[PDB]
Amino acid sequence: ACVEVDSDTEAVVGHGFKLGCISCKMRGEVQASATVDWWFMAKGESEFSHIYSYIDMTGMVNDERFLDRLNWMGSKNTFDLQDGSIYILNVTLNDTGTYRCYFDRTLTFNYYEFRTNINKTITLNVVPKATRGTASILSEVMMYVSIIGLQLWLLVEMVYCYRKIAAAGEEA
């Protein structure tokens, strides 16, 4: 099948991170032809730039902050695409900002070449020394609340049953 997922945005410094963008064609079926363009709003100011462009070869963009570093782990081969995710090797704190992918596709149906375009936006947030994600920690703790809580009703009711019946045990 095919399901689009909104990527992770909490990242760890000195690290190879994945911002994966998936745009699924409303009808995963009809033969397309695609191109990916990444854009970047820094927290310097609100001015985008080319940082990455792709058509069935590596589209490498000179932007020296990001140059000599990136890598395509999008959909390889068929240039149908759908899933473009690039990796940011060796992340530093200067990378914190907002990404905007552009898939532009010429779906060539088989009757009439037509084109359309999609935008997803990802706000990268660089945090040192990675945590677990506050719902892996949270469900870590709620598990042992229930487990201890139960381990009590078991020794509550057993002690409570145990007193009760040896008390009826002296009548036998």
């Binding site: 099948a1 399901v3 689009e4 409303m26 009808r27 719902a135 469900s139 598990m143 139960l150 019946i165």
Partner: protein, 1140 residues
């Protein structure tokens, strides 16, 4: 005088055996294409021969009055009709109706057509029950879906700069003519329709640039639209009989919405329900046609006995000695069970026919069967010498063995006709005598020719009669308007343009697949005449089958340590611990259905699932602990249910261990099977079924063995001949202008892209053929199998389009002997097997626990008794003659009329009718609501408290309060809500039941057995639940072809439950099978990345694929046949307390 002379001629046999010949020659003549040398002279020949018979039949019996006495019998009556018409055509089905002579001559057939018409006199009480019942689903099914199948996927025109299809400069004029066009719209490759798309939130979206508009052609040819009452009704009728109903289901869910499964569960389940209510009318009729056969015939065995009683008052020495050396060993039982050794051993030896078979096998199996031929010959010749040849002959198995030996030695001379090897394998039935239940199957097959051999001819005639009807009325038409049907004007694979194809198309339409013919038929034929035949060929055809299929059945008749244990056992006894486990089961399994694809999309629920299963597992560890010290190791393991909780939670031990394999995601996926122990209602079903199973094994053994002979035979005919040389681009098979061999197929591949592909489900092995033999029994996917199989030429040759069309017989000679007589035995054992368990093992009855038995009995006192007298005359100057208004029967019948005009008021609601007609309907609807509201209000005042008593009045006051809401909701108005608001209008038509009486009795028996009908589905839903989650972890993302197009996939638990139900009634199981069957590339991108999930490849395994469905259809077919029992014992249970 001259008149008298005729009477000598009339009473003869030797003139009637001329009439027996002029039918048997005109029967065969009417078949073929018309020959011109044997011209209309022949047409005129068999004209006068019937006239020369009718003249003698009238110049026997008097002058005009005498001729009239002549016409007192109906048979002599038809004869006039046929000749009367034939004679007129001097200056045409009536030529065909000559073949009805066949029935007139034989005095044995006249008992049958005298039975099969009198049985239709009785059944007419239940037609109205159903045709009214079908029509109340149509008005439900029409108002939900009016014009929903009409939806098409239409383009939105280009807003470009240049004026190439400029509609952002002008889209005003062409609109209504634009969207009709096929070129503008969409339809994926290989579909003679467009792409139904409905724009509800969930249902079946369409490619970008296109939109979901209403207007278009209709599905198929036009004969599927809901718009208009009849066609929708026909579809509704289609859904009752299950004829290709999956497609209708598929095009409704796509068009209207995914969430309209609930409509097709009410339809299919009731659709099934009325089928069993027709059948039980025949049971209560076809007993009466065999009660009188035991009333008067024993009385005629007494009438002859009473009257009869009154009347009374070196070499020749060894011509016997070596004969005795033969005669000693034959009567010894070391000959007897030696032969059954060689018969079974001959069967297997034959069966190992793998397809390629190099010289190792190809010499082995050749030289193997010649050894058994020596065995069978020396079996024969040493039994000729033994007991006089004639004596050996008299037993027919000695005669049947005699037959095969001659056949057996034929094969050596030949060195296509190698089906003759397999006629050894009918000697298995020889086994039967020792065997218990095959001795019922050869009792059944011999019964279709013996004491019930009269009836099979009536089947064999009436099946034939419609093969001459459809030949005459349409055979010239398919030549002349062929083009409507195909693309290239070449004559489809089911045509009327000959007899023999015509015959199949009535043999198909008798099996219950008659829509796929009618779509064609109506178009190249006509709308009224085609529909007149098919509705007839069921209603006659179905009735004939039922009598045959019923009548075959009815002729087949330490001090602290101890205290600790008690506490452990005492805590299990509590309702609180037991229902705490029950909520732990339903919540563990409810997280389990969150498993598939979309789980990578939501992040937190991947985490919730990961941590919750430890706690759920830990609860079941505590339960596995506390079951032990309750029951102890002996009593815990010996309980049957308690085995599972050791297994499934034990597989959770072996899962939590292996942190310190992927096999055990299967078991966890099986853990909601454990609710069978916990819920009481299911257990009764599990217990009853277990009782069913031991016998079922024995019935199964017969059929597997019986089919096996068919499977062995099939491989011989077809094996490896199914290969087809296929072009890649269109997936049309290559013509055979080029490619007769596969060896010359390869050369083309070298230059080009064209490939030589096997058929996926075929007769390549005796077991792979076994599967393809299952498909051609349950009628799904069988079309593909044949088309290849007809066209087969050799082991290497390429199949041309239409060689060898006489091989439809192998399926027809099967589907009768392997589906009809097989299944009629299977029902013959169960409905005895529940006669033994209910009487002998039954406590009171079945499928009901302990309180359901009392609530069953609470519903018995409801029907039989409940009658109050005159109420609340309440004379008063404020309320005087109002008691006459409620109670006079001048009223009660007239309110029937006020529904009945309102019933046909809603039957004219069609699609695209215009406001004016619509406006009248809206005005009419308001008037109807007012009449009952005034009436019910009138009833309320007169009867004050007392009337509220009748529950019909309460129902009456149920429905009108609903219908008030239906108009004020419309003054408010979401399209989805508004249609289901109009579903409330249907319930006025349900008020006609207490008029009916006839309907109301049988429809009450639905209520009577509905809690037993609740468990049968509850275990059924559990069964569906198991295969859904087992489907998702395997059969998501398989390459979507055929039945798994865009909705009906196992991507989620959302789409699986829809997908499975379609397969519970064993439709479309072929549709499902092909993707999962396919493996590798071509057809697998594997290493392929679905964008989003974590698993590569779209490959589907053939191991997991086959046993998924084949062990679902066996689990389909038990529990639904279990369901038909708990209706039939209750509606035949009403017919005995009623008579007495």
């Amino acid at each position: 005088p001259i008149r008298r002379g005729a009477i000598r001629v009339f009473v003869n046999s030797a003139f009637n055996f001329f009439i027996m010949f002029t039918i048997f020659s005109n029967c065969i003549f009417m078949t073929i294409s018309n020959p011109p040398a044997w011209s209309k002279i022949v047409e005129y020949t068999f004209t006068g021969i019937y006239t020369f018979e009718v003249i003698v039949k009238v110049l026997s019996r008097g002058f005009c009055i005498g001729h009239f006495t002549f016409l007192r019998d109906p048979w002599n009556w038809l004869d006039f009709s046929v000749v009367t018409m034939t004679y007129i055509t001097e200056f045409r089905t009536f030529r065909v109706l000559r073949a009805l002579k066949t029935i007139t001559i034989f005095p044995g057939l006249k008992t049958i057509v005298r039975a099969l018409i009198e049985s239709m006199k009785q059944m007419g009480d239940v037609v109205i029950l159903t045709v009214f019942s079908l029509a109340v689903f149509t008005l439900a099914g029409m108002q939900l879906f009016m014009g929903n199948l009409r939806h098409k996927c239409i383009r939105w025109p280009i807003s470009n700069v240049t004026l190439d299809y400029e509609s952002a400069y002008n889209t005003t004029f062409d609109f209504t003519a634009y969207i009709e066009n096929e070129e503008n719209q969409y339809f994926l490759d290989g579909a003679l329709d467009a792409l139904l798309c409905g724009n509800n939130s969930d249902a079946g979206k369409c490619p970008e640039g296109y939109t979901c508009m209403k207007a278009g052609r209709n599905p198929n040819y036009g004969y599927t639209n809901y718009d208009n009452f009849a066609w929708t009704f026909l579809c509704l009728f289609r859904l009752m009989l299950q004829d290709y109903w999956e497609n209708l289901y598929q095009m409704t869910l796509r068009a209207a919405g995914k969430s309209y499964m609930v409509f097709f569960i009410m339809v299919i389940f009731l659709g099934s329900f009325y089928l069993i209510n027709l059948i039980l009318a025949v049971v209560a009729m076809a007993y009466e046609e065999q009660n009188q056969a035991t009333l008067a015939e024993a009385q005629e065995k007494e009438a002859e006995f009473q009257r009869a009683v009154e009347q009374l008052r070196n070499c020749c020495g060894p011509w016997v000695f070596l004969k005795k050396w033969v005669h000693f060993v034959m009567m010894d039982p070391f000959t007897d069970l030696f032969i059954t050794l060689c018969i079974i051993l001959n069967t297997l030896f034959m069966s190992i026919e793998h397809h390629p078979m190099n010289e190792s096998f190809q010499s082995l199996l050749s030289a193997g069967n010649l050894v058994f031929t020596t065995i069978f010959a020396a079996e024969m010749v040493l039994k000729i010498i033994a007991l006089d040849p004639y004596y050996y002959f008299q037993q027919t198995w000695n005669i049947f063995d005699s037959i095969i030996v001659s056949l057996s030695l034929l094969e050596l001379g030949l060195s296509g006709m190698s089906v003759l090897r397999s006629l050894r394998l009918l000697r298995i039935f020889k086994l039967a005598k020792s065997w218990p239940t095959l001795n019922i199957l050869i009792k059944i097959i011999c019964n279709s020719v013996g004491a019930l051999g009269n009836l099979t001819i009536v089947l064999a005639i009436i099946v034939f009669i419609f093969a001459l009807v459809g030949f005459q009325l349409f055979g010239k038409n398919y030549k002349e308007y062929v083009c409507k049907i195909s693309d290239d004007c070449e004559l489809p694979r089911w045509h009327m343009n000959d007899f023999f194809h015509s015959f199949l198309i009535v043999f198909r339409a008798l099996c219950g697949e008659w829509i796929e013919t009618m779509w064609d038929c109506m178009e190249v034929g006509g709308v009224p005449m085609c529909l007149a035949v098919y509705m007839m060929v069921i209603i006659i055809g179905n009735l004939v089958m039922l009598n045959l299929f019923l009548a075959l059945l009815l002729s087949s008749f330490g001090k602290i340590w101890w205290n600790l244990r008690r506490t452990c056992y005492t805590i299990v006894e509590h309702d609180y611990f037991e229902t705490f486990i029950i909520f732990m089961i339903l919540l563990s399994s409810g997280v389990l259905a969150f498993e598939d694809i979309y789980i990578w999309r939501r992040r937190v629920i991947k985490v919730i699932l990961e941590y919750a299963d430890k706690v759920f597992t830990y609860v079941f560890i505590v339960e596995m602990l506390l079951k032990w010290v309750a029951y102890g190791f002996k009593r815990y393991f010996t309980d049957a249910w308690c085995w599972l909780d050791f297994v499934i939670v034990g597989a959770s031990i072996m899962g939590i261990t292996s942190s310190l394999i992927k096999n055990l995601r299967t078991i966890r996926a099986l853990r909601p099977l454990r609710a069978l122990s916990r819920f009481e209602g299911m257990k009764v079903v599990v217990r009853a079924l277990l009782g069913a199973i031991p016998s079922i094994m024995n019935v199964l053994l017969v059929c597997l063995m019986f089919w096996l002979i068919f499977s062995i035979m099939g491989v011989n005919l077809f094996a490896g001949k199914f290969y087809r040389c296929i072009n890649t681009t269109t997936d049309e098979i290559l013509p055979v202008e080029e490619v007769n061999n596969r060896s010359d197929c390869m050369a083309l591949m070298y230059t080009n892209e064209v490939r030589w592909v096997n058929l996926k489900v075929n007769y390549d092995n005796a077991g792979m053929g076994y599967l393809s033999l299952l498909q051609v029994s349950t009628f799904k996917g069988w079309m593909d199998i044949m088309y290849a199989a007809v066209d087969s030429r050799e082991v290497e040759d390429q199949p041309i389009y239409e060689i060898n069309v006489y091989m439809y017989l192998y399926f027809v000679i099967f589907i009768v002997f392997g589906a009809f007589f097989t299944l009629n035995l299977f029902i013959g054992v169960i409905i005895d097997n529940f006669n033994r368990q209910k009487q002998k093992l039954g406590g009171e009855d079945l499928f009901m626990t302990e309180e359901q038995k009392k609530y069953y009995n609470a519903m018995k006192k409801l029907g039989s008794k409940k009658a109050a007298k005159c109420i609340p005359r309440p004379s008063n100057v404020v309320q005087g003659v109002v008691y006459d208004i409620v109670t006079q029967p001048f009223t009660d019948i007239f309110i029937m009329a006020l529904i009945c005009i309102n019933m046909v008021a809603m039957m004219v609601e069609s699609e695209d009718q215009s406001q004016v007609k619509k406006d009248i309907l809206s005005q009419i609807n308001v008037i109807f609501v007012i009449i009952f509201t005034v009436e019910c209000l009138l009833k309320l005042l007169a009867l004050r408290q007392y009337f509220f008593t009748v529950g019909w009045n309460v129902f009456d006051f149920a429905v009108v309060v609903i219908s008030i809401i239906g108009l004020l909701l419309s003054d408010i108005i979401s399209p989805t809500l508004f249609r289901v608001i109009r579903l409330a209008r249907i319930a006025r038509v349900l008020r006609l039941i207490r008029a009916a009486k006839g309907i109301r009795t049988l429809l009450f028996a639905l209520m009577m057995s509905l809690p037993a009908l609740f468990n049968i589905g509850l275990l059924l839903f559990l069964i569906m639940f198991i295969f859904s989650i087992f489907g998702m972890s395997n059969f998501a993302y398989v390459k979507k072809q055929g039945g798994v197009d865009d909705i009906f996939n196992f991507e989620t638990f959302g789409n699986s439950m829809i997908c499975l139900f379609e397969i519970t009634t064993s439709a479309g199981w072929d549709g499902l099978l092909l993707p999962t069957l396919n493996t590798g590339p071509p057809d697998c991108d594997p290493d392929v990345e679905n964008p989003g999930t974590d698993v590569r490849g779209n490959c589907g395994n053939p191991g997991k694929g086959i046993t998924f469905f084949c062990s679902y259809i066996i689990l389909s077919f038990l529990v639904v046949v279990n369901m038909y029992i708990a209706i039939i014992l209750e509606n035949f249970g009403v017919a005995q307390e009623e008579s007495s």
